[PDB]
Design a protein around this ligand. Structure first.
Ligand SMILES: Nc1ncnc2c1c(I)cn2[C@@H]1O[C@H](CO)[C@@H](O)[C@H]1O
Length: 327
């Protein structure tokens, strides 16, 4: 293990601002070489509860690390290529107490946005963490609930998500398994079209001025050469007992689909998540401009039609290749 200062030299540490959180830990934004990055920091191996849950062991955190790498690498592949997952810059195992400058950032977020986490000031100098440094992906879909232009943007978002998931299905038999709207990131792009390749066939997607990145592989699954990497949630109580959002039904529906056998490949889970996201787009998102032109009213009708038909597709690949929305 390395000290925090290895990952976060002084100027980089000074520029850290907290941008997100979960039971897992903390996410900070900073900058190096003029380029923003997101730093995900997860305590591991220790006995303390953190945000009410036990810390993962090294063995338990490895799947997320491996999957983050494999998905990042899709941006440079040939037959199955997508930039729709987040870039991974580095992963380190760090040892130390939590840096005071990160506690200062933590406090600022707590004062302005409020936090559901414990202030991370109780770790000793032997504490281990995993620090994952990612590309900065923009703002999550949930925080953009009231910020998008029109449902035309929603179409581009769904098309990008479907294409990324398809390429990952084809390359890695990938299932995301936790693609709630906190895990769909949006960034401005000056590209008019985005490019992907699926089983050696290249295509494009109109960007509507946004690039989508999918994040957070804590519950994800994939395989290479029959070696499966996944999170076995077969004995988890709480994951399947959520209420108040269609998100929590997706966990249940995934368990129905796979008969509680999480090592298996069931790409229908990607379809379930895409259905949940389509549902968010039609029910919870609110757009600055409503559908007023005939072209835009046809877009709304097509997204509604996608919502009511997509559950009859077997995978994100089947949706991309066969759904009328993407013709
Ligand atoms: N790479 C990134 N770029 C930008 N924001 C990021 C990330 C990552 I990793 C996470 N987040 C933000 O933190 C929240 C919790 O994962 C997410 O919901 C999101 O708001």
């Amino acid at each position: 293990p390395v000290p925090f200062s290895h990952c976060l030299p002084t100027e980089k540490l000074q520029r850290c601002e907290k941008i997100g959180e979960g039971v897992f830990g903390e996410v900070f934004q900073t900058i190096a070489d003029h380029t923003p990055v997101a730093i995900k920091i997860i305590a591991i191996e220790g006995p303390d509860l953190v945000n009410g849950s036990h810390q993962k062991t090294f063995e338990e955190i490895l799947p997320e690390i491996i999957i983050s790498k494999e998905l990042s690498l899709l941006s440079g592949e040939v037959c199955n290529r997508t930039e729709g997952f987040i870039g991974l810059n580095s992963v380190h195992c760090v040892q130390g107490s939590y840096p005071p400058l990160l506690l200062k950032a933590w406090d600022h977020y707590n004062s302005t946005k409020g936090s559901a986490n414990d202030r991370p000031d109780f770790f000793k100098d032997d504490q281990l963490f995993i620090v994952l440094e990612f590309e900065f992906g923009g703002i999550d879909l949930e925080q953009m609930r009231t910020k998008l232009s029109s449902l035309a943007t929603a179409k581009s978002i769904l098309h990008q998500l479907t294409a990324s998931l398809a390429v990952a299905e084809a390359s890695l038999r990938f299932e995301h398994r936790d693609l709630h709207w906190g895990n769909v990131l949006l960034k401005k792009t000056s590209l008019k079209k985005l490019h992907y390749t699926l089983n050696g066939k290249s295509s494009t997607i109109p960007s509507c001025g946004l690039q989508v990145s999918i994040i957070d592989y804590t519950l994800s699954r994939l395989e290479r050469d029959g070696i499966v990497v996944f999170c076995d949630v077969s004995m988890d109580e709480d994951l399947f007992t959520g209420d108040g959002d269609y998100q929590f039904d997706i966990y249940r529906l995934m368990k129905k689909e796979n008969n509680n056998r999480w090592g298996e490949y069931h790409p229908y889970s990607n379809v379930l998540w895409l259905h949940y996201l389509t549902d968010k787009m039609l029910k919870q998102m609110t757009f600055k401009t409503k559908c007023n032109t005939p072209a835009m009213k046809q877009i709304k009708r097509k997204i509604q039609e996608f919502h009511r038909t997509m559950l009859n597709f077997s995978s994100a690949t089947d949706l991309l290749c066969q759904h009328s929305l993407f013709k």
